[PDB]
Design an enzyme around this catalytic site. Structure first.
Site, PDB file in Angstrom:
ATOM      1  CB  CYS A 196      -4.987  -1.104   5.637  1.00 57.58           C
ATOM      2  SG  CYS A 196      -5.962   0.088   6.749  1.00 57.58           S
TER       3      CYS A 196
ATOM      4  CD  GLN B 179      -1.352   0.191   3.731  1.00 60.22           C
ATOM      5  OE1 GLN B 179      -1.645  -0.680   4.117  1.00 60.22           O
ATOM      6  NE2 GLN B 179      -1.489   1.418   4.343  1.00 60.22           N
TER       7      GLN B 179
ATOM      8  CG  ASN C 193      -0.344  -6.148   6.874  1.00 60.44           C
ATOM      9  OD1 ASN C 193      -1.135  -5.344   6.530  1.00 60.44           O
ATOM     10  ND2 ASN C 193       0.683  -5.809   8.044  1.00 60.44           N
TER      11      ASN C 193
ATOM     12  CG  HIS D 255      -3.463  -2.357   9.719  1.00 61.05           C
ATOM     13  ND1 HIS D 255      -3.192  -1.463   8.548  1.00 61.05           N
ATOM     14  CD2 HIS D 255      -2.892  -3.507   9.567  1.00 61.05           C
ATOM     15  CE1 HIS D 255      -2.511  -2.372   7.523  1.00 61.05           C
ATOM     16  NE2 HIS D 255      -2.273  -3.371   8.196  1.00 61.05           N
TER      17      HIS D 255
HETATM   18  C1  LIG Z   1      -4.989   1.698   7.180  1.00 58.22           C
HETATM   19  N1  LIG Z   1      -3.768   1.849   6.294  1.00 58.22           N
HETATM   20  C2  LIG Z   1      -5.246   2.471   8.159  1.00 58.22           C
HETATM   21  N2  LIG Z   1      -6.672   2.380   8.672  1.00 58.22           N
HETATM   22  N3  LIG Z   1      -7.011   3.173   9.967  1.00 58.22           N
HETATM   23  C3  LIG Z   1      -8.174   2.865  10.567  1.00 58.22           C
HETATM   24  C4  LIG Z   1      -9.042   3.915  11.197  1.00 58.22           C
HETATM   25  C5  LIG Z   1     -10.237   3.633  11.315  1.00 58.22           C
HETATM   26  C6  LIG Z   1     -10.959   2.315  10.973  1.00 58.22           C
HETATM   27  C7  LIG Z   1     -10.176   1.254  10.525  1.00 58.22           C
HETATM   28  C8  LIG Z   1     -10.745  -0.101  10.207  1.00 58.22           C
HETATM   29  F1  LIG Z   1      -9.843  -1.018   9.760  1.00 58.22           F
HETATM   30  F2  LIG Z   1     -11.757  -0.049   9.637  1.00 58.22           F
HETATM   31  F3  LIG Z   1     -11.100  -0.484  11.530  1.00 58.22           F
HETATM   32  C9  LIG Z   1      -8.763   1.488  10.136  1.00 58.22           C
HETATM   33  C10 LIG Z   1      -5.942   3.976  10.480  1.00 58.22           C
HETATM   34  O1  LIG Z   1      -6.268   4.606  11.568  1.00 58.22           O
HETATM   35  N4  LIG Z   1      -4.733   4.230  10.055  1.00 58.22           N
HETATM   36  C11 LIG Z   1      -3.688   4.969  10.481  1.00 58.22           C
HETATM   37  C12 LIG Z   1      -2.460   3.632  10.899  1.00 58.22           C
HETATM   38  C13 LIG Z   1      -1.187   4.285  11.580  1.00 58.22           C
HETATM   39  N5  LIG Z   1      -0.379   2.936  11.686  1.00 58.22           N
HETATM   40  C14 LIG Z   1      -1.213   2.258  12.928  1.00 58.22           C
HETATM   41  C15 LIG Z   1      -0.178   0.866  13.353  1.00 58.22           C
HETATM   42  C16 LIG Z   1       1.248   1.271  13.069  1.00 58.22           C
HETATM   43  C17 LIG Z   1       1.682   1.698  11.549  1.00 58.22           C
HETATM   44  C18 LIG Z   1       1.099   3.076  11.424  1.00 58.22           C
HETATM   45  C19 LIG Z   1      -4.187   3.380   8.667  1.00 58.22           C
HETATM   46  O2  LIG Z   1      -2.990   3.661   8.196  1.00 58.22           O
END
Ligand SMILES: *C(#N)C1=NN(C2=[C][C]=[C]C(C(F)(F)F)=[C]2)C(=O)N([C][C][C]N2[C][C][C][C][C]2)C1=O
Length: 215
Positions: free
Chosen positions: A25, A19, A182, A162
């Site tokens: 994601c 990605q 992933n 994520h």
């Molecule tokens: C993806 N990529 C991504 N997704 N979210 C997210 C927000 C709200 C709901 C969901 C889900 F999957 F539907 F439940 C997903 C998100 O907040 N981010 C920020 C991620 C920051 N990362 C956290 C883990 C470590 C690496 C950085 C997303 O990128």
């Protein structure tokens, strides 16, 4: 339901994707689930377009965030989603450029598994195929996972940050797991995959936001 299942062995899963620096994601997760159903329905396996979702699902926030549920609904309402080849991935915000001629799959809706019910998740995966799920992947240990069944008492099921894809489940030396695909490239985890603790009080909230599309 089988004691263990792995849809990669049944030709339902495409190779690991990257990605990049776009927080899409949810798009790769949705696409993975869709690719599995398309295979089950037509017998063909094709790379679906996550960029198509990122740019066209107004219900979501593109690289800024989104849900797989909104993606499945878009495909249904839009009457189709393009193939990855017809709408390549760039991982950058762009106006919607969907083109029906490149359509490679449709959607009849979606179903959600009972929140936090890993037993329901197990049955869903065994019967349907790859299932979209959300987890807390913010821990450093997850970032540097190499092998084995991932388990960390620090994971927060309330922090779903994520979206990934559960392509099966099994057990290793008494430790039950979920086979997770992933979208951080093949240079992450085990060739892009990670085995995550199953039936461990919903570790990382793997069963808090799981759904799958119907075709
Ligand atoms: C993806 N990529 C991504 N997704 N979210 C997210 C927000 C709200 C709901 C969901 C889900 F999957 F539907 F439940 C997903 C998100 O907040 N981010 C920020 C991620 C920051 N990362 C956290 C883990 C470590 C690496 C950085 C997303 O990128």
């Amino acid at each position: 339901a089988p004691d263990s299942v792995d849809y990669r062995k049944k030709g339902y899963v495409t190779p690991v994707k990257n990605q990049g620096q776009c927080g899409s994601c949810w798009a790769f997760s949705s696409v993975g689930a869709l690719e599995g159903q398309l295979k089950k329905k037509t017998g063909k396996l094709l790379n679906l377009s996550p960029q198509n979702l990122v740019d066209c699902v107004s219900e979501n926030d593109g690289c800024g965030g989104g849900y797989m549920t909104n993606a499945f609904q878009y495909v249904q309402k839009n009457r189709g989603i393009d193939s990855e080849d017809a709408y390549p991935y760039v991982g950058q915000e762009e106006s919607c450029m969907y083109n029906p001629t490149g359509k490679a799959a449709k959607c009849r809706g979606y179903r959600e598994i009972p929140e936090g019910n890993e037993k329901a998740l197990k049955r869903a995966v065994a019967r349907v195929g790859p299932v979209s799920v959300a987890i807390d992947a913010s821990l450093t240990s997850f970032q540097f996972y190499s092998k084995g069944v991932y388990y960390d008492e620090s994971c927060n099921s309330d922090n779903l940050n994520h979206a990934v894809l559960a392509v099966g489940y099994g057990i290793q030396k008494g430790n039950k797991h979920w086979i997770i695909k992933n979208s951080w490239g093949e240079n992450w985890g085990n060739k892009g995959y990670i085995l995550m603790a199953r039936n461990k009080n919903n570790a990382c909230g793997i069963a808090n936001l799981a759904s799958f599309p119907k075709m």
